[model samples]
Target: SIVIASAARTAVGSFNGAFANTPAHELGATVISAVLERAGVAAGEVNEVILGQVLPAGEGQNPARQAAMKAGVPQEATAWGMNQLCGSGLRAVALGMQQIATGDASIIVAGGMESMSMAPHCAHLRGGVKMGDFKMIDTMIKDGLTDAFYGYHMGTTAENVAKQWQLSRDEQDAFAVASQNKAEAAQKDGRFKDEIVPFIVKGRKGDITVDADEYIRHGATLDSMAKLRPAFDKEGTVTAGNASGLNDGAAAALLMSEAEASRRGIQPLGRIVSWATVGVDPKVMGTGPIPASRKALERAGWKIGDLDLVEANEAFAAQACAVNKDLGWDPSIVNVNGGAIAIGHPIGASGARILNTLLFEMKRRGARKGLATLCIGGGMGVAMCIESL
Candidate 1:
C-alpha cells in the first residue's frame, strides 16, 4: 500500500484577481516547495515529479520538466507530465502510485498547476505554406475540437446537462447559495488551515500574503444568484451563478510505500486504497462520474453507504445533482464544505485540490473512508478511494 505523507495547496484565486501577478511556473514551484516543507523530506529523497497540466500555451514544452527545475528538485530526478483534462491531477497521482507499487520508485511528488489568466488566444489564420505561395491560415486543431462541442462552448454544455437532469433555475441558485455558506463556515472553523499554504503576491501597492481561499464570495445570497441572467442560454437553466468560476492555483502531495514510510520514520496520513476512471457519452460528459464512482467503490470493496465523505466536483449544478441522484448519495455527506460552484475550479489543479480538502476533512472528522471524484472533458470521469491511517 502507498501512504500520503504530506499535502499542500495555494489559495484558489480568480485568474486576474489575487493571483493575477503570479505566473504558472512560479505557482508550481511554490506548491512543490510547500509540500516538501510539510513532509519534512529533503529533495534528495524524491525519485520523480509527476505533474498534471491541461493548457500549455504559456508553459513551454515539457511544463513538468520546467517546474521540476524551477522548484529546485535535483536535475537527476526524473520528471513526467500527464494530461487528462480535468482529471490531470488525479491521473498524475495514479501514475506515481503505479510506479511505487511496482517497486520502480520510492518517494514521488505528484500534483498539478494551472493559470487560465495567461491562456493564450489561439489564432486560426496566420502565416503558413500555401499552394499559391500566399500566407495560409494558422488554424490550430485544438480550437476546432473546442468549437465542435457546443456553439456556446463549455458553458452551454453545462446548461444542457442542467436541463437534461431537470435541475431548475431555483434549484441551481439554492445549491450555489449553499456552497458559499458551507465554504465560508469551513473557513471560519479553520477546516482548511492544514492544507492551505499561504503565498505572497507582488501587487502595485506592495507585496501581500494571502492565506485563505480568495475565490469565495461570503456575501452571496439566493436572491442575488436568482437575479442573474442565464449566460449560456436565455431559455436554459444554467447561469454564471451556478457554474464554476475560472481560477488559478497549484497543489501537491507526497506519496510513498507503507514500508518505506515506516523505515523513514514518517507518519502516514492516509492510503490510496483504490481508484478508477471511466468514460461516458460526450453529449452529457458531466454525468460520467456515476459509472466512475461505481467502479471505484467496487474496486475498494466499499459502497456509497460506507463512504464517510464524498467530494464530487461540481463542474456544474446540473451534473453535480445528477451524479448524486444516480448514485443514491446523501447530500448530507457530499461536498459539505462547498465545491467548484463556490470555491472556483482551477482546471488541472482541481483534482488534487479536492483530494487535499478531502484528506483534511477526514482528519478533522476522524472519519475512516472518503472519495474524491471528478468529471473530465471528452466524456471521462475519475474516482479515487482513500482511507485514513
Candidate 2:
C-alpha cells in the first residue's frame, strides 16, 4: 500500500495579494521542502517528483523539475508536470501512489501549485499580425476558465448547475455564509496550523511571513451575500460571493510504500485506499463530485456513511449543495473547516490542499477515514479516499 508519510502547504494568498509577486514554481518548492522535512526524509531518498499546475505557459519549462531542484532533490531523480484543470494536484498524488503501490519507486514527492496573480497574458501573433488588430490573450481564462467544448466561462457552467439543480440564490448565499463562519472559527482556534507552513515573502520594504489564508470574509452574512450581483448571467444564482476565489498556493505530500516507511522507522499519517476519476457533461461541471465520490466509495467497498470526514471542494455553493442533495451524504461531516469558498481555490493546488487539509483534521479528531473530492474545470471530477494510521 502507498503510505502518506507527511504533508504540508503554504498559506493561500488571495488574488493579487501577498503572493502576487511569487511564481507557481516557488510556491511548489516551498511545500516540497517542507513536506520532506516533516517526513524526516533526505532529498536524495526520493525517486520521483510529480507536480501539477494549471497555468504553465509563462512559468518556464517543466515546472515540476524546477521545483524539485529548487527543493534540493537529487538531480538523478526524475520529475515531470501535469495538468487536469482543477484535478491536477490530486491526480498527481494519485500517480505517485500508483508508482509506489506497484513497487516502481520507493519514495515520491507529489502535489501541485498555482499563482493566479502571476498568470501571464499572451499575444498569439506567431508570425506578426501585419497590423490590423492584435489582442493579448489572458491564458488564465483561455486555458483555465473557458470550457473548450462550448467556450462558456466556468461561472456560466455553475449557473447551468444551479438551474438544473433548482438551487436558489438564497441557499447558495446561506452556504457561503456558513463557509465564512466555519473558516473564521477554524482560524480562531488555530486548526489550520497543523497543515499550513509559513511563507516568507520578499517585499520592497522587508520580508513578511504569511501563515494564514487571506480570503475568508469575517462575519459574512446572508444579507451581505445577497447584495452581491450575479457573476455569470442576469438571472443566475451563482455570484462571486458564493464561488471559489482565485488564489495562489501550493501543497505537497511525501509518499512511499508502507514497508519503506517502516524500514526507515517512520510513521505514516494515512494510506490511500482508493481513488476515482470520472467525466461528465461540461455544461454542468459542478455535478462531477457526486458520481466521482460514488465510484470511489464503491471501489473501496464502503458506504457514504463510512467516511468520517469529507472535503468536497467548494467550486460553487450550487454544485456543492447539488452533490450533497444527490449523494445523500451527511452535511454535518462535510468540510468541517470550511472550504475553497473561504480558503481560496488556487486551481492547481486545491486538490492536494483539500487532501492535506482533510488528513490533518482527521489526525486532530482521531478520525479513521476521510474523502477529498473536487469538481474539475473541464467536466470531470476526482475523488480520493484515505484511511488514517
Candidate 3:
C-alpha cells in the first residue's frame, strides 16, 4: 500500500501580492526541500520527481527538472510535469501513489506549483512568421481562465449554475461570510501552520518572511461582501468575494510504500486509498465535482457519510452551494475550515494544498477518512480519498 510520509505547502499570496515575481520552480524547490527534511529523507534517495503546473509562462521549460535539481536531487533522477488545472497537484500525487503501489519506485516527491502573478501575455503570428506586430493576449486570462472549447470565461459557468439553482446574491454572500469566519477562526487557532511553511518574499524595502495566508479578510462583513458587483453576468450572483481568488503558491507530498516508510524510520501521515478524474460539460464546469466525488467514493467502497472531512474546492460559492444542495450535504459537513475562496487558489497547487489541509485537520479532530476534490478549468473534476494513519 502507498502511504504519504510528509506534506507541506507555502502560504498563499494573492496575485501581484507577495509571490508575483517568484518563479514556480523556486517555490517547488522550497516545498520539496521542506517535505524531505520533515521526513528525514535524502535527496539522493528520491527515485523520481513529479510536479504539477498549469501556467508555466515565464518559469522556463522543464520545471520538474528545475525543481529536482534545485532541491539537490541526484542528476540521474527522472522528473516530469502534469497539468489538470486546479487538480494538477493532486493528480501528480495520484501518479506517485500508483508508482509506489506497482513497486516501480521506492520513494517519490510529487506536488503542484504555480505563479499566476507572473504569467506573461503572449502573441501568435498569422499567415507568415513575424511579418508584422501581432496582437497580444493576456495568457492567464485568455488561456489560463478561459474554457477553450466553450469560448467563455470560467466565471460565466458560475453564472450558469447560480441561475440554474436560482441562488440569490444574498445566499452567495452568506456563504462567503461563513467562509471568512471559519478561515479566520482557523487562522487564529494556528491550524494552517501545521502544513504551511513561510516563504521569504521581496518587499518594497527588503525581503520579508510571510508565514500566513494572505487572501481571507479576517474581519469581513456581509454588508461589505454584498456591496461588490456581479463579475460575469449583469444579474449573476457571483462576486469577487463569492469566488476563488487568483493567487500564487506551491505544495508537495512525499509518498512511499508502507514497508519502505517504516524501514526508513518515517511515520506515515496518511494512506492514499483511491483517486478518480471525470469529465463534464465545459459550459457548466464548476459543477463537475458532484459526479466526480460520487465516483471516487464508490470506488473506495465508502459512503458519503463515511467521509469525516470533505474539502470541496470553493471555485465559486454559487457552484459550491448548488453542489451541496444537489448532494444533500449539510453545509457544515464540507470545508470545515473554509476553502479556496478564503485561502486563494493557485491553479496548480490547490489540489495538493487542500489534501494537506484535510490530513492535518483530520489528525487534529481524530477523524479517520477525508476526501479532497476540485473542479478543473476545462469541464472536469478530480477527486482523491485518504485515510489518516
Candidate 2 residue spans exceeding 4 A from truth: none
Model 3: how far residue 227 lies from native, Å: 1.3
lDDT of each: 0.81, 0.91, 0.87
Q: How accurate is candidate 1 locally (lDDT)?
A: 0.81
Best TM-score goes to which candidate? 2
Candidate 1: where are CA atoms >4 Å away? 124-152, 203-205
Query: Model 2 over residues 1-389: C-alpha lDDT tens digits?
Result: 78899999999999999998898888888898999899899898989999889887877889899999999999999999899999998999999999987778989999999998999899867688886887888888898889999888999999988988899988899899999999999988999998999988977899999998899888888887899999889877888999998899999899998888898888888989999999999898898998899999999899999999999999999999998899888898899999989999999999999998898999999989889999997799999999977
**Which stretch of 10 consecutive residues in model 3 shows the poorest summed lDDT?**
124-133
Q: How would you encode candidate 3's per-residue C-alpha lDDT over 1-389 as one tens digit per residue?
A: 88899999999888898887998888888899988998999899999999888888767778889989998999988898888888898899999888878888889998898889988988654556646566678878875799898787899999988888898999989988899899999998999998998787766789889789999788889998989998877667888989998899999999999888888888778888888899988887888888888889899999888888889888999888887887665667688988888999998888988988987888889889888988887889989989987
Worst 10 residues of 2 by lDDT: 124-133
Ranking by lDDT, best first?
2, 3, 1
Ranking by TM-score: 2, 3, 1
Write down the RMSD of all candidates, one decimal each. 3.0, 0.9, 1.7
Could you tell me the TM-score of candidate 1? 0.93
lDDT of model 1 at residue 16? 81
Residue pairs whose backbone atoms clash in candidate 1: 124-139, 126-138
